[PDB]
Amino acid sequence: IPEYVDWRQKGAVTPVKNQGSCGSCWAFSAVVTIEGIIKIRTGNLNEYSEQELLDCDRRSYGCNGGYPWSALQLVAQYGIHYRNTYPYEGVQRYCRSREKGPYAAKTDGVRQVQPYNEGALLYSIANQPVSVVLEAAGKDFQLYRGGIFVGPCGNKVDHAVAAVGYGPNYILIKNSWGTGWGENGYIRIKRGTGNSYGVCGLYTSSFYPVKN
Ligand SMILES: *[C@@H](C(=O)O)[C@H](O)C(=O)N[C@@H](CC(C)C)C(=O)NCCCCNC(N)=[NH2+]
């Protein structure tokens, strides 16, 4: 795998989004991986519905948090609608996937990256955007403005995001806190420290969709 990966340069990453006050990051994270794998497999970049996963993933807890894996499993089981068809409302409502017509995309399955292994995650990122989790509760992370972020941060993960690239000393992360946070909505998080957890627990729980 190469020294640098940046799926934005490959046209596989949609504009940065803002989840608002709702604890829906798990759905945003899942959607970035779906947008990426559909572009990789089909050549088209489309935006998908975070709101649909928020409403319809019965394993997750709406705006009270949830599971990227469960959201990805829903897309493999059933499918997902375009964002335009099922736009983001920032509040969990009744699942409306039966009343929105046929699904726009469908995946084949969901695979977990071997946890607590930076190279395994880099290998995954070299193939496609990956859903990852990190500790975002620290003000150091909350106030991040740019550069390669080293912390301070612990490994009490609480926030799902998406890894869309990497370089020799960082992993490139698409956050869901709007374009005014970080580097136009992104953070570069230091890698190569030899911590198994990853900086801010970044290697704790990583999933990606499979699409034949
Ligand atoms: C993300 C956010 O917008 O803050 C959101 O809180 C979330 O997805 N949290 C996850 C933490 C990481 C993705 C690991 C989470 O805590 N999920 C667990 C489900 C919520 C807890 N239980 C209940 N019953 N609500």
UniProtKB/Swiss-Prot annotation:
Repressed by the active-site-directed cysteine protease inhibitor E64 (L-trans-epoxysuccinyl-leucylamide-(4-guanido)-butane) produced by Aspergillus japonicus. Inhibited by the inhibitor of cysteine proteases from Trypanosoma brucei (TbICP, rhodesain) and Colocasia esculenta cv. Kaohsiung no. 1 (CeCPI, tarocystatin). Repressed by leupeptin, a peptidic cysteine, serine and threonine protease inhibitor. GO terms for biological process: proteolysis. It comes from the Eukaryota. Optimum pH is 4. It catalyses: Hydrolysis of proteins with broad specificity for peptide bonds, but preference for an amino acid bearing a large hydrophobic side chain at the P2 position. Does not accept Val in P1'. The keyword Glycosyltransferase does not apply. Disulfide bonds join 22-63, 56-95, 153-200. One of its GO terms (molecular function) is serpin family protein binding. Its EC number is 3.4.22.2. Leupeptin binds at residue 25. Optimum temperature is 50 degrees Celsius. Unstable upon 65 degrees Celsius. E64 binds at residue 25. The active site is at residues 25, 159, 175. Keywords: Allergen, Disulfide bond, Hydrolase, Protease, Signal, Thiol protease, Zymogen. Cysteine proteinase with a high level of diversity in substrate specificity, an amino acid bearing a large hydrophobic side chain at the P2 position is preferred. Belongs to the peptidase C1 family. This is Papain. It comes from Carica papaya (Papaya). The lineage of its organism: Eukaryota, Viridiplantae, Streptophyta, Embryophyta, Tracheophyta. The chain holds residues 134 to 345 of 345 of the full protein.
